[PDB]
């Protein structure tokens, strides 16, 4: 794909916000694409990183990995620029072998996307209650 | 929540496939809740596991964790019952602190579910292309 801007709509609990994301290039050390929030200052922006890793002599299967972090800005007294109080993290890693087909990988992707809107994962992720 | 049958729709590239997942109990020794498909042979089942871990004297973070395992099976030359050829995995970890509000957690969840349906990630996961 091409690193373009990404608009994420119908986001949040009410489902009425947007998160717009500007591409921040790839990293020649790791091979990781980066995307940040529109606006910003550095160290107070919402970050999305994504990498894809091929087979090698060490690991035999492909590995896709998404990693999103986002801070909370608190304005203390006596200072003009905010500090970060909390980070929230999520990181998905997909593992697919070399004889896997496009249909199977799309099935995993869309299964996870459909599953995160189910009441078990609502009540697990944003209420922190386990299943019983 | 309580474990009941989760049925997921609009799965696949076409978005015309469903999947039902029946409850398979909670494991008391780690707190992992399980959902599986409706087969007789246990090695051929697509399964989902989900847990959430409280803070302790070591981690100091709430940790939500979802896993997806899809086998693909086929019967070989001179073989009668099908054996499992491939495994497609998925492993999501959410990490939060004690002072995070629920709207932050819902934002991270909906942000992930909206990233999984964006052309950058459906090109990186389906066709195995790093973002370039």
């Amino acid at each position, epitope marked *: 794909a091409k690193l373009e801007t990404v608009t994420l709509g*119908n986001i*949040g*609990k*009410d*489902g*009425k916000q947007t998160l717009v994301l500007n591409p921040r290039g790839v990293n020649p050390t790791n091979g990781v694409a980066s995307l940040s929030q529109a606006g910003a200052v550095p160290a107070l922006e919402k970050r999305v990183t994504v990498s894809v890793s091929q087979p090698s002599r060490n690991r035999k299967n492909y590995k896709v990995q998404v990693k999103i972090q986002n801070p909370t800005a608190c304005t203390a007294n006596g200072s003009c620029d905010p500090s970060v109080t909390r980070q929230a993290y999520a990181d998905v890693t997909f593992s697919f072998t070399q004889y896997s087909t496009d249909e199977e990988r799309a099935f995993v992707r869309t299964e996870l996307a*459909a599953l995160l*809107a*189910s*009441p*078990l994962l*609502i*009540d697990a992720i944003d*209420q922190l*209650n386990p299943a019983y | *929540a*309580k474990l*009941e*049958t*989760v*049925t*997921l*729709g*609009n799965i696949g590239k076409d978005g015309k496939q*469903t999947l039902v997942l029946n409850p398979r109990g909670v494991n008391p020794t780690n707190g992992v809740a399980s959902l599986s498909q409706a087969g007789a042979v246990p090695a051929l089942e697509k399964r989902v596991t989900v847990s959430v871990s409280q803070p302790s004297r070591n981690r100091k973070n709430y940790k939500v964790q979802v896993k997806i395992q899809n086998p693909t099976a086929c019967t070989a030359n001179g073989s009668c019952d099908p054996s499992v050829t491939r495994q497609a995995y998925a492993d999501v970890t959410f990490s939060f602190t004690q002072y995070s509000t629920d709207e932050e957690r*819902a934002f991270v969840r909906t942000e992930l579910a909206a990233l999984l349906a964006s052309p950058l990630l459906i090109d990186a996961i389906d066709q195995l292309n790093p973002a370039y």
Partner: nanobody
Amino acid sequence: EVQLVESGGGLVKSGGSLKLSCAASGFTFSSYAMSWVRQTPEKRLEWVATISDGGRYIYYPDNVEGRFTISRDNAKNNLYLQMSHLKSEDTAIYHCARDSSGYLPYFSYWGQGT
């Protein structure tokens, strides 16, 4: 114990309006999809409306869509149906229902009232 009680009720004339309500204790209300299912005096069931977890995706049939409106209050744990224009077929029981953990609803828990 999934409990669902209704209020509003009513005896109206034609072309009026009314607002049915639902109280919804026993479970985590804000996780589940909720729904309205009415029952005619000739004992036929009819789906009325569904809403999503946060109130974003709302479904109506064609007989309903221009003149009914549903909403949630996840802090007060209340479900709301705003009935309007009341064209004399709307003389039913109007149960609350909790949807299944799914994609399109099959009602598992029901509320008797109105």
